[PDB]
Amino acid sequence: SAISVWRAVDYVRMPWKNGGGSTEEITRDAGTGLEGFGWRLSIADIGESGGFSSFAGYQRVITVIQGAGMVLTVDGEEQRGLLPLQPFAFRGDSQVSCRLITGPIRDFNLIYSPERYHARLQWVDGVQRFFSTAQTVLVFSVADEVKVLGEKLGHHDCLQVDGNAGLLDISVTGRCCLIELTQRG
């Protein structure tokens, strides 16, 4: 139905309050409410070790997309290593800090409200084909050319399908992340 292509050359980089990194917003839900937000997609540049903000009540899934990896500590559990393209889910409630090992990292970030949205996320490669009733489908490229729905996405470009109301049949070729989001009733 309604296809949008977010080109990474258009993303606006915004320094974090604290000076330790910056965020490029890709896209997000269209709600307005003072009552919290529904879902947001972004790229975070992490330039220093330190603590992350918390987002109480939200679910997060983050993935290293540039640089060699970093280590997270979540709620003082044992340290966890994040390698490139390995997705990692955690609660926004959690207290989280990051230790850079090889220097700065860029992360692909999904955050959503589980009260408000159903969600799916999967990193894929090669030739893929799926059918989905999801209202919003997102395709985020980590390759020079990901082909999807007649568009060609370069590195960190993102295709978005919105307002779907039947069963979508989507083929994708290349290395990318597939996200699907649907408002809960």
Among the residue ranges 30-38, 78-86, 100-108, 117-125, the one whose residues contact its own copies (CB under 8 A):
30-38
Say what the alpha-carbon torsion angle 153, 157, 162, 168 is, to the nearest 10 degrees.
30
Among the residue ranges 34-42, 75-83, 101-109, 117-125, the one whose residues contact its own copies (CB under 8 A):
34-42
Size of the site for its own copies (CB under 8 A): 32
Cα–Cα distance between 119 and 121 in angstroms, integer?
Answer: 7
**Among residues 20, 21, 27, 58, the one that binds its own copies under rule CB under 8 A:** 27
Residue 28, interface with its own copies (CB under 8 A)?
Answer: yes
Alpha carbon separation from 95 to 26, 53, 61, 101, 160 (Å, rounded):
25, 8, 15, 20, 31
Neighbours of 106 (CB within 10 A): 20
Task: Indicate the residue among 29 and 180 with the shorter CB distance to its own copies.
Answer: 29
Among the residue ranges 35-43, 80-88, 130-138, 171-179, the one whose residues contact its own copies (CB under 8 A):
35-43
Residue 50, interface with its own copies (CB under 8 A)?
Answer: no
Ranges of H-type helices in the chain: none
Site string for its own copies, 146-165 (x = CB under 8 A): -----xxxxx-x--------
In angstroms, give the least distance from the CB of 137 to its own copies.
Answer: 16
In angstroms, give the least distance from the CB of 3 to its own copies.
Answer: 8
Contact (Cβ atoms closer than 8 angstroms) between residue 112 and residue 119: yes
Residue 91, interface with its own copies (CB under 8 A)?
Answer: no
Site string for its own copies, 122-151 (x = CB under 8 A): -----------------------------x
DSSP E strands in the chain: the ranges are 2-6, 13-15, 21-28, 39-46, 50-51, 59-66, 70-74, 80-82, 88-91, 96-100, 105-112, 117-124, 127-132, 136-141, 146-148, 151-153, 158-162, 168-173, 176-183
Write out the residues near its own copies by the rule CB under 8 A: 1-5, 7-14, 17, 25, 27-37, 151-155, 157
